[PDB]
Amino acid sequence: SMDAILQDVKTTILQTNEIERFAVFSREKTIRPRPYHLSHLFLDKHIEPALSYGGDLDVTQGAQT
Amino acid sequence: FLHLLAPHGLKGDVIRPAFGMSEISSAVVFSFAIERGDENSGVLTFEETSLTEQLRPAEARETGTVSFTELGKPIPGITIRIVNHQHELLPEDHIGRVQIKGPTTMKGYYRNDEANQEVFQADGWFHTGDLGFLHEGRLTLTGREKD
Amino acid sequence: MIIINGKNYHNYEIEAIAEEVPGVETSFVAACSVRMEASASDELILFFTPKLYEPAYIMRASQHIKSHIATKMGLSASRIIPVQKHAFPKTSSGKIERAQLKTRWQEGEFDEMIMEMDMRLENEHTLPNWSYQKKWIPAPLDAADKQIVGDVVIFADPLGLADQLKSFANSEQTYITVEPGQAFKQLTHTHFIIHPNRPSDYEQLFETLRSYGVSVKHIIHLWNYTNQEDKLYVSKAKQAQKTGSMSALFLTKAISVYEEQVAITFVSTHAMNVPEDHIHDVEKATTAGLMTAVQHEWPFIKVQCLDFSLAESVSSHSHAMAMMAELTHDQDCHVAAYRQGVRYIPFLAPLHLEKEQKRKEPPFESSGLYVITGGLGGIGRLVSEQLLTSYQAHLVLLGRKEREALSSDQQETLSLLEKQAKVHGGKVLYEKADITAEKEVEAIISRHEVAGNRRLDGIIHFAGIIQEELLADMTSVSLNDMYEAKVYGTIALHEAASKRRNVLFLSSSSARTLKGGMTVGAYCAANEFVEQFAHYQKLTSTVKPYCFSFSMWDEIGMSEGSMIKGMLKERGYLPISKQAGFQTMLACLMTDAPLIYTGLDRSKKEIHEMIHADAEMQTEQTFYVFFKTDQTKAVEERLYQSIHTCLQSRLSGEYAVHLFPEEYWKETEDGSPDEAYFHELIEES
Ligand SMILES: [Ca+2]
């Protein structure tokens, strides 16, 4: 019944006339549970110097020239 | 120097580091903690790995660390900072271009304008070109540009 | 024009290059930019429409575009947001209403599928579904025409179960009964006395039995088949070990050297906490937890533990009757529990954090008093950093050494926390203390309860050493060095939390306890207690516990010098990063589940056999189709729906159609489909 399905899919691929040659094969695989999305569990808000001064200098004391 | 001349009466902390240019009218920082007995006083050792990031202090090693002598705090009357390659202020421990401002800054190069555009970019903050960090509020030079 | 740090690009080129990518509908592409609140640069947001609106086709092209931009233009697209054709906004004049899409996206029409994309790639928003609970499920026994054929040793109980079991013995077998006492004393050739805690008396027992010609083929250990005591100090914990979990060590060590097959059978009362049971002598759990490592280290020693309840039941299924049945019947599962004359075995069941959620944010109070053990450990810091930044908590860290004697690696990771606390308004102290002393704990807590006028808000108990050591070399102190933190310490901390109301209790364990492990008897023995303890607290006291038993840590190193400990991954124990795990803890903390196993791949067999045991895994058939059309009428959508309609209600399983563009189809010369190129693609997928 498995390859019987494969055959009835090819005939379904021929239902569309715009396609004139194709190829189809199947695979069996194990599922890995879908992860969560952080938005679904968590709340929104959780998801989200070098400058030295030497000290003032009194420049107005003493010779200005 | 100190150990070889000590028997002749030179005291251990006489030495006085200072970083000054011609454009700034000479020294702008002074280090007083340079003792004979204490080779680490005024001397900062860091890991070579952290030179690009936050400097990580390290121990005296022959291959793997670097020692920088502290020049000291800016002089009474001026302010010093350091900037990144985009001319933004840097964090405490990151290395950057030393930039100095105060009343000791020259008028400007005589008959040379584009040189003025490089040195004091904006607000008279002078680009020394010397690369160094400013830790604890006391400047510590790392290396001059292209030297 | 759109700009990115360093250069700017014309959106006509971006969209034009993206239209080369197979599956991109021509002229339905958009390029924008936005500076997130980081403002460090401008990121490229990119919209497009696929010739098929189904995530397989989309995810296929989203990657192909993101890379094709990095190849041809030198940059990668931050996000790529798919949008159906019938809702792609354009003006009558063919202009692409770009600024509308951005504003339409910040509102989140495309959230619905930008999530479905995040899920399929297990993105930073993935939060894998890998957490389960232990659920006690009924499993009866099969009919058994086999009978016991051997001489049996039996460490007799004081309640009379031993007496019952002897009456069933066949006429050919001799039953050697052993009682506990002050030291070795042989009363008869079939009656003995030994000091349960002295290992010599065990090997001497068997040695003198080898002489008398008794071939020991079965051992029964009814020594933690006790009657209930309600007080639970630490002494009672230390003391019950020697009559129980330690005894099991010595007994197995002794009979292991003869290297002869033998059927040991431990028997407990109130060691396992199932639903509807009002008594829980949890101190007995280490016994059953240590023996997990036996069948791995000494394959010739079959082991199975049983737990019964003395909650009054007028011999509805006499303990003796069940006892015999389990002995004759092919030892299958390690542990089982008879409660009301009903055999139960422990199975796993997924947590389903969303559907079981009972709370929207972690249950930590803002500036609450929280005491932490081994907060300087890799997993402790994660929790300490959190309780100091996000919450501004008064933390007191308890270590066993003194501050000055800490690892230079630790003293730093503490100063970090001291600084990281000063700048977040929290406080963090450290105190040398004996985690094991009931009174020394209440004294040290009370002090911190008055400094800040807050009552204790929670205990986080991650302290623990690991020693990989085999039952062969396992000294009696090896265990008592293990129990110090994970048992005797745990009991002292709970001694305080029980005197307050609704205190939070966090506990770390391991999933090795599920199936057992070689050279980890000490680990499994203690962790089987910490896990079973959470249930003791929910039954005894106000405390609200959360116990995470993790599969693996990246703290054991991804290299480890033994990448064959990763082989344990191959049986279904994933490595979990700090963030991945830490995030899990929070998610679970929002669910009231008190015990939770995390890091388990329900795909791999060992785990799958723990959730179902009998039903086979579930397969999903995935069809792959390839294209070659006469005209250019995009039939993808018309075709997908055509195949999906042929499969409707006709497979009896889980199916999915996966479609490929036209411009992947290839043909070998001589007029045949290039099947080599297809079977190659399906795997690279
Ligand atoms: Ca195209």
| Residues after which chain A is discontinuous, using a C–N cutoff of 2.5 Å | 48
In angstroms, the Cα distances linking B75 to A65, B72, B103 are 21, 9, 11
Identify which of C126, C602, C635 has the shortest CB distance to residue A19.
Answer: C635
Cβ–Cβ gap C627/A16 under 8 Å: no
Query: What tokens were used for B93?
Result: 């421990």
Cβ-based neighbours of C426, under 8 Å, separated by 6 or more? C367, C387, C388, C389, C391, C392, C393, C394, C395
Alpha-carbon distance of C2 to C32, in angstroms, equals 7
In angstroms, the Cα distances linking C22 to B1, C61, C67, C552, C664 are 75, 7, 13, 42, 9
DSSP state of C222: E
Do the Cβ atoms of C588 and C596 come closer than 8 Å?
Answer: yes
Alpha-carbon distance of C266 to C225, in angstroms, equals 9
Question: In B1-147, at which residue ranges do the beta strands (DSSP E only) sit?
Answer: 20-21, 26-27, 29-30, 43-47, 65-69, 73-74, 79-83, 96-101, 126-135, 138-143
Angle subtended at Cα C290 by Cα C288 and Cα C294, rounded to the nearest 5 degrees: 105
Pairing label, strands B73-74, B79-83: unpaired
Alpha-carbon distance of C21 to C652, in angstroms, equals 36
Do the Cβ atoms of C192 and C182 come closer than 8 Å?
Answer: no
Q: Is C127 on the interface with A (CB under 8 A)?
A: yes
Q: Is B27 on the interface with A (CB under 8 A)?
A: no
Instruction: Please name which of C90, C87, C129 lies closest in space to residue C110, comparing C-alpha atoms.
Output: C87
Do the Cβ atoms of C59 and C121 come closer than 8 Å?
Answer: yes
- The owner of tokens 């937890």 is C289
Residue of A21, A29, A47 best to disrupt the C interface, most CBs of C under 10 A: A21
Count CA atoms closer than 13 A to B39's CA, side-chain side: 7
Alpha-carbon distance of C553 to C581, in angstroms, equals 9
Alpha-carbon distance of C667 to A21, in angstroms, equals 11
Q: Is C390 on the interface with A (CB under 8 A)?
A: yes
Query: What tokens were used for C340?
Result: 């009301």
Residue C656 phi/psi, 5° resolution?
-165, 135
Cβ-based neighbours of C613, under 8 Å, separated by 6 or more? C347
Query: What tokens were used for C580?
Result: 């991945």
Alpha-carbon distance of A12 to A5, in angstroms, equals 11
How close B29 gets to chain A, by Cα (Å)? 9
Residue of B19, B32, B80, B131 best to disrupt the A interface, most CBs of A under 10 A: B80
Cβ–Cβ gap C125/A5 under 8 Å: no
C188 alpha-carbon distance from chain centroid:
50
Cβ–Cβ gap C623/A16 under 8 Å: no
C238 alpha-carbon distance from chain centroid:
28
Alpha-carbon distance of C540 to C522, in angstroms, equals 27
How close A9 gets to chain C, by Cα (Å)? 6
Instruction: Please name which of C679, C663, C678 lies closest in space to residue C627, comparing C-alpha atoms.
Output: C663
Cα of C16 from ligand 1 centre, angstroms: 10
Count CA atoms closer than 13 A to C128's CA, side-chain side: 19
Tell me the chain A residues in contact with residue B78 when contact means C-beta distances shorter than 8 Å. Answer: 53-54, 57
Cβ-based neighbours of C84, under 8 Å, separated by 6 or more? C49, C53
Q: Is A35 on the interface with C (CB under 8 A)?
A: yes
User: What sign does the CA torsion over C534, C535, C536, C541 have?
Assistant: positive
How close A3 gets to chain C, by Cα (Å)? 11
| Residues after which chain C is discontinuous, using a C–N cutoff of 2.5 Å | none
Q: Is B94 on the interface with A (CB under 8 A)?
A: yes
- The owner of tokens 């001349």 is B5
Report the largest interatomic distance among the alpha carbons of chain B, rounded to a whole angstrom.
54
Do the Cβ atoms of C46 and C101 come closer than 8 Å?
Answer: no
Query: What tokens were used for B138?
Result: 């006391």
Q: At what angle are helices C521-540 and C476-483 packed, to 10 degrees?
A: 40
- The owner of tokens 């240019």 is B21
Q: Is A30 on the interface with B (CB under 8 A)?
A: no
C189 alpha-carbon distance from chain centroid:
49
- The owner of tokens 């019947």 is C329
Cβ-based neighbours of C126, under 8 Å, separated by 6 or more? A35, A36, A37, A38, C118, C119
- Looking at residue C118, its amino acid is D
Q: Is C601 on the interface with A (CB under 8 A)?
A: yes
Q: Is C638 on the interface with A (CB under 8 A)?
A: yes
Cα of C48 from ligand 1 centre, angstroms: 12
- DSSP, collapsed to helix, strand or coil, labels residue C507 as strand
Alpha-carbon distance of C265 to C220, in angstroms, equals 5
Alpha-carbon distance of C587 to C602, in angstroms, equals 19
Cβ pairs A/B, distance under 8 A: 53
Q: At what angle are helices C378-389 and C578-589 packed, to 10 degrees?
A: 60
Query: What tokens were used for B71?
Result: 């020049």
Using left for φ > 0, alpha for ψ between -120 and 50, and beta otherwise, residue C85 falls in alpha
DSSP codes of every residue in C440-460: HHHHHHHHHHHHSS--EEEEE
Alpha-carbon distance of B32 to B35, in angstroms, equals 9
Cβ–Cβ gap B103/A59 under 8 Å: yes
End-to-end CA distance of chain A: 108
Q: Determine the residue of chain C that is closest to A40 in CA distance.
A: C354
Cβ–Cβ gap C586/A31 under 8 Å: no
Cα of C234 from ligand 1 centre, angstroms: 74
Query: What tokens were used for C354?
Result: 């969303």
Q: At what angle are helices C490-497 and C438-451 packed, to 10 degrees?
A: 50
Go through B27-40 and write b for each residue having 16 or more CB atoms within 10 A of its CB, e for each that does not.
bbbbbebbbbeeee
In angstroms, the Cα distances linking C89 to C29, C85, C119, C475, C563 are 10, 9, 27, 75, 53
In angstroms, the Cα distances linking C513 to B142, C4, C246, C672 are 56, 52, 18, 56
User: What sign does the CA torsion over C7, C13, C15, C17 have?
Assistant: negative
Alpha-carbon distance of C231 to C240, in angstroms, equals 13
Alpha-carbon distance of B34 to B60, in angstroms, equals 17
Q: Is B18 on the interface with A (CB under 8 A)?
A: no
Cα of A9 from ligand 1 centre, angstroms: 27
Cα of C660 from ligand 1 centre, angstroms: 13
Alpha-carbon distance of C491 to C470, in angstroms, equals 26
Cβ–Cβ gap B137/A56 under 8 Å: no
- The owner of tokens 């008869």 is C188
Cβ-based neighbours of A36, under 8 Å, separated by 6 or more? C119, C126, C127, C128, C129, C353, C354, C587
DSSP state of C400: S
With 0-12 / 13-18 / 19 or more C-beta atoms within 10 angstroms meaning exposed / middle / buried, residue C211 is: exposed
Q: Is A7 on the interface with C (CB under 8 A)?
A: no
Query: What tokens were used for C439?
Result: 């009174």
Instruction: Please name which of C511, C502, C505 lies closest in space to residue C492, comparing C-alpha atoms.
Output: C505
Q: Give chains near A: 3+ CB pairs under 8 A.
A: B, C
Q: Determine the residue of chain A that is closest to B101 in CA distance.
A: A53
Do the Cβ atoms of C324 and C154 come closer than 8 Å?
Answer: no
Tell me the chain A residues in contact with residue B79 when contact means C-beta distances shorter than 8 Å. Answer: 51-54
How close B25 gets to chain A, by Cα (Å)? 15
Cβ-based neighbours of A58, under 8 Å, separated by 6 or more? none
Tell me the chain C residues in contact with residue A7 when contact means C-beta distances shorter than 8 Å. Answer: none
Query: What tokens were used for C286?
Result: 């280490």
Query: What tokens were used for C644?
Result: 């999906």
**H or E stretch including C685?**
none
Cβ-based neighbours of C474, under 8 Å, separated by 6 or more? C249, C253, C521, C522
Query: What tokens were used for C515?
Result: 């199936």
Q: Is C654 on the interface with A (CB under 8 A)?
A: yes
- DSSP, collapsed to helix, strand or coil, labels residue C568 as helix
Query: What tokens were used for C136?
Result: 């006690």
Alpha-carbon distance of B117 to B120, in angstroms, equals 6
Alpha-carbon distance of C284 to C529, in angstroms, equals 8
Cβ–Cβ gap B135/A50 under 8 Å: yes
Query: What tokens were used for C497?
Result: 């939390």
Residue of A20, A25, A26 best to disrupt the C interface, most CBs of C under 10 A: A25
Q: Is A50 on the interface with B (CB under 8 A)?
A: yes
Cβ–Cβ gap C361/A43 under 8 Å: yes
Instruction: Please name which of B42, B51, B55, B65 lies closest in space to residue B92, comparing C-alpha atoms.
Output: B55
Do the Cβ atoms of C243 and C196 come closer than 8 Å?
Answer: yes
Alpha-carbon distance of A6 to A11, in angstroms, equals 9
Instruction: Please name which of C346, C211, C326, C343 lies closest in space to residue C285, comparing C-alpha atoms.
Output: C346
Cα of C668 from ligand 1 centre, angstroms: 24
Count CA atoms closer than 13 A to C422's CA, side-chain side: 5
Cα of C25 from ligand 1 centre, angstroms: 6
Cα of C67 from ligand 1 centre, angstroms: 17
Tell me the chain C residues in contact with residue A29 when contact means C-beta distances shorter than 8 Å. Answer: 619-622
Tell me the chain C residues in contact with residue A19 when contact means C-beta distances shorter than 8 Å. Answer: 627-630, 635, 639
Alpha-carbon distance of C239 to C232, in angstroms, equals 11
The number of beta carbons lying within 10 Å of the beta carbon of residue C274 is 18
How close A51 gets to chain C, by Cα (Å)? 20
In angstroms, the Cα distances linking C567 to C189, C195, C503, C564 are 49, 41, 39, 5
Instruction: Please name which of C421, C422, C417, C395 lies closest in space to residue C406, comparing C-alpha atoms.
Output: C417
- Looking at residue C86, its amino acid is H
Identify which of C350, C642, C654 has the shortest CB distance to residue A12.
Answer: C642
Cα of C249 from ligand 1 centre, angstroms: 71
Do the Cβ atoms of B121 and B135 come closer than 8 Å?
Answer: no
DSSP state of A38: H
Alpha-carbon distance of C483 to C529, in angstroms, equals 10
